[PDB]
Design a protein around this ligand. Structure first.
Ligand SMILES: *[C@H](CC(C)=O)c1cccc(-c2nc(NCCc3ccccc3)c3ccc(N)cc3n2)c1
Length: 331
């Protein structure tokens, strides 16, 4: 068992192993720290009251399991997890340790005009991480520039104002209950567009405007999609709209690499059934410089059956304790 030390930072007490030094607040609450064991700079997240309630406790468990499962170069994983508690009885605090990445894509994009090469590399990496996440039957749902962290070498990792709505797939905006993994592809298309133009592709003021902006680009639904809409409300909306043709994306992204344009056309498809998958996008010619199918790994199957369980706080808490105790660090 390691030796811990205590200290207070902005009206919060941090109790951590001596391994971690120079705790410095950066934003649960998150501190930057020095990992003496590896000379890495790391982010230490102390979870905000993880067992306050059933919903807090299930979330805490959900977060830990997910992070323990993610083992991929383009997805934030867990370097360490600990609690100062010596028993389940006193277990009331959870700390998660991950790589501290320098910046995020929103910082970058707001502060430099990217080259096509650089966009290729960045988008390639997002898709590589998406492939792995999707192969685990996980949907991110919240992809946006601030959820993508980058180091000075531009190595990218997917994490967990830049408004969420601006990256949300139209089927989520319309509230479809059976959306799929390709909602993340829509987000990637919107991120790619912004990297290439320095502009938010669809900066809606509200949900209605967001859809107006979207439909202006991609056109209104055809009959092939309308015959797939199960509910009257959504069909009444679609049939409301001024019949709009799809823009030719070459007239939107003027001077972009036409393979970038082609890829965007394949990402930003209104009908999610016809949207390219992450695996398929990785093999697109746009990423010819980076694509290697022998180094684009899939994940082990991820057991999400706990999502459908209704358990007591103590039960969620104990399960979390177990996940903490059983943690095996990465090499
Ligand atoms: C009906 C009620 C349910 C089952 O939730 C329903 C509500 C909302 C959305 C769908 C639905 N949407 C899409 N994509 C919508 C795309 C669109 C078009 C215009 C404006 C915004 C969004 C679907 C795509 C494909 C299939 N198979 C089904 C879809 N259902 C349904």
């Amino acid at each position: 068992r390691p030796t811990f030390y205590r200290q207070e930072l902005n009206k919060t007490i941090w109790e951590v192993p001596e391994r971690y030094q120079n705790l410095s607040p950066v934003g649960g609450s998150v501190c930057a720290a020095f990992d003496t064991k590896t000379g890495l700079r790391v982010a230490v997240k102390k979870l905000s009251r993880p067992f306050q309630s059933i919903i807090h406790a299930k979330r805490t468990y959900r977060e830990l399991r997910l992070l323990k499962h993610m083992k991929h170069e383009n997805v934030i994983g867990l370097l360490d997890v600990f609690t100062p508690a010596r028993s389940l009885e006193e277990f009331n605090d959870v700390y998660l340790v991950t790589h501290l990445m320098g910046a995020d894509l929103n910082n970058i994009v707001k502060c430099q005009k990217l080259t096509d090469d650089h966009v290729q590399f960045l988008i390639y990496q997002i898709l590589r991480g998406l492939k792995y996440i999707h192969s685990a039957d996980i949907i991110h749902r919240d992809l946006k520039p601030s959820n993508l962290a980058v180091n000075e070498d531009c190595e990218l990792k997917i994490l967990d104002y830049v408004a969420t709505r601006w990256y949300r797939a139209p089927e989520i905006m319309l509230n479809w209950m059976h959306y799929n993994q390709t909602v993340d592809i829509w987000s990637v298309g919107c991120i790619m567009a912004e990297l290439l133009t320095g502009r938010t592709l669809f900066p809606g003021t509200d949900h209605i405007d967001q859809l107006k902006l979207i439909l202006r680009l991609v056109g209104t639904p055809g009959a092939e999609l309308l015959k797939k809409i199960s509910c009257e409300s959504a069909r009444n909306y679609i049939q409301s709209l001024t019949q709009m043709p799809k823009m030719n994306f070459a007239n939107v992204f003027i001077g972009a690499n036409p393979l970038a344009v082609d890829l965007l056309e394949k990402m930003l498809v209104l009908d999610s059934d016809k949207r390219i998958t992450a695996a398929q996008a990785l093999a697109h010619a746009y990423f010819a410089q980076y694509h290697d199918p022998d180094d684009e790994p899939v994940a082990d199957p991820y057991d999400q059956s706990f999502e459908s369980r209704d358990l007591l706080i103590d039960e969620w808490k104990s399960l979390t304790y177990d996940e903490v105790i059983s943690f095996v660090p990465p090499p």
